[PDB]
Symmetry: C3
Subunit: 272 residues, 3 copies
């Protein structure tokens, strides 16, 4: 268990939106990926560079009420203010009552809780969300991690039919973190690939009875993730991922997972 | 298991609401917690005190059609009538063909099926629902059980922004039963606490691959439950639970899990 | 690992519907159930008999982009055209990185991806969907398999309050395939029966921590399945299945699982009056 520190800034972006960044003027949507091992503590020295109050609230990880990031617990940040948020994590283990204490490991996320409303409705809509992965000892690490956020009817706040697209080579181990926000339920689908509906997205062995799926219903603040072997059994190609709610895909909730051959080529495709 | 008996009443309450109770004039929304162990049989001597037909339908448990609670199976109750409903439960075990029969244990719920419409739409909207827990041998029992029902846009049919709140002390084993009803999907989220998305909400040990979550999508008639150690690794505090659909939390689908230090105090909140 | 071949047709049906069939003039909604064992390859000689482009896209199974059925991968079928799609499947096994590759087995489905929109919105609305089950070696085979598709507010595109109903006898091992399409979330519920929320719908043994449920939230393109012993612990009768979203059940997303005693009768079933 490391004690770790990062800087985080909330920034209003040059278009209407709001993003978290590791440096001033470097905010992105989704915000930066934070990755911790069970047992790690992370102290986030957060600065609200904006002219309205903003905060940081995390799902899944251990935090005290002073890092709730809510007005209820007086832990939002005033305009131009600073505040150190502290996230802890723990490994699993046996309690003295005999029961098993679940570890912090999983696919989690952080978001604003005071911009617009006391639930972060405006901050979330504008782009103040990001992914957090907590790894258990032994967990398989990927070649790349891509984050896909279905925020109301947009993916990663991109306009309709404007990606994001993600590139990989055949055989790469690719991790996806899939988070949902806002008002609507969605169904996440990926062509050509499938995963297990469990903590890691991967079956533990022949005895794991988890459902293997390629389509999953998700609502606001749900998060899951998985790893696939890019192109496994299916080959290189533009593999669409999309919400499968028919009007949402028609409205533009679609992107591409472009899986290239080891020569860098891909079968020809005709994007929107 | 054991053969158990209870009486249950349906009654009208103020504001056109309707509720089940274990004694006349003590109807509540949600209705009483019913708890059984696998193998138990429960006979419910049900009296409909209201002036419209009503019934009792349960999820999960074993019942014959004569206790379906539906007009289809002629088992609703006339105004002022009484009917005995019988719920049975079974432990898991292997069938003669080697297949594994799942037990009755789970977090389940009962509700009306004939008020308003032949699917109980009015009776459910008005308050006729409650929780039933069926425990398996060796399950850990909690210090307290709280029931949270997302019924359309209300929690436990309370007005917007009026809880319910639930209190515990740091370290208490607290069980939550979470039931959803009506028209809408929701997402249930709890600050500072998490649970396993499996039967008990606790992982069975180091080999259980269940996702550990703090936010869960639910729809009408879904039920799940879990136990946490109150404030485990996070301390005392006013820990919100709420629907995480943004308009629903803005419109008041929020409550507090108030976890007090052993001296009874709580970090200052609001 | 057998190589199998079938023909499939997409055809217009009455009343603005569309369906898949194994022969011309025999299209059904849902389309024909396709059943494979892990390791089998299926080549589907598909003919689009309609006046609009149409396709076949499958969930879960292995296919190259040439069998994607999308305009993005140029693998839909012009009016009157024919195309051979190929679906492959594999067994699970250990990869050389030490992880376990999930097998193809599961309850899956196929549907059009180009009628109406480049997401098949018009095709799926009209009836172009069907079930696919891929079995793992050793899986238990049922006495009967019934498919229930919640397509927007209709079940199997049938008029509201028109079923379908399915019949069994007490003790039958009955398999259900449950698929959802369109715009709405639903919750699938069955009276008197419950199943495990895992790959087969049955717990693998005392060690399997899966949730045992009788009610499950589903959204467009979700598919799951299960088997029950009909009437187990509850007896014969008309056992309702329905969406549990209240206005949906009120508007007719309801049907019956009709479970007969071994003497053939259904408790409480009295379609006719008697003299006196
Ligand atoms: Cu919150
Ligand atoms: Cu969507
Ligand atoms: Cu949140
Ligand atoms: Cu019902
Ligand atoms: Cu809600
Ligand atoms: Cu019900
Ligand atoms: Cu698609
Ligand atoms: Cu429905
Ligand atoms: Cu699809």
């Amino acid at each position: 268990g490391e004690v770790r520190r990062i800087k985080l800034y909330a920034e209003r972006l040059a278009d209407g939106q709001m993003g978290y960044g590791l440096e001033k003027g470097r905010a992105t949507i989704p915000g930066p990926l934070i990755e911790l091992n069970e047992g790690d503590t992370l102290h986030i020295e957060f600065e609200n560079t904006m002219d309205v109050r903003a905060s940081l609230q995390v799902h899944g990880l251990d935090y005290e009420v002073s890092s709730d990031g809510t007005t209820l617990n007086k832990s939002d940040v005033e305009p131009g203010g600073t505040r150190t948020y502290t996230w802890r994590t723990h490994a699993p283990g046996r309690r003295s009552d005999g029961t098993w204490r679940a570890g912090s490991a999983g696919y989690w996320h952080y978001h604003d809780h005071v911009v617009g409303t006391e639930h972060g409705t405006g901050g979330i809509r504008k782009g103040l969300y990001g992914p957090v992965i907590v790894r258990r000892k032994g967990d398989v690490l990927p070649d790349a991690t891509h984050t896909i956020v279905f925020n109301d009817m947009l993916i990663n706040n991109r306009p309709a039919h404007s990606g994001p697209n993600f590139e990989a080579t055949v055989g790469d181990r690719v991790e996806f973190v899939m988070i949902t926000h806002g008002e609507y339920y969605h169904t996440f689908h990926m062509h050509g690939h499938r995963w297990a509906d469990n903590r890691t997205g991967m079956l533990t062995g022949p005895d794991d009875p988890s459902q293997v799926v390629d389509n999953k219903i998700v609502g606001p603040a749900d998060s899951f993730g998985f790893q696939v072997i890019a192109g496994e059994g299916v080959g290189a190609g533009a593999w669409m991922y999309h919400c499968h709610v028919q009007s949402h895909s028609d409205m533009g909730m679609v992107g591409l997972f472009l899986v290239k051959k080891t020569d860098g080529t891909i079968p020809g495709y005709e994007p929107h």
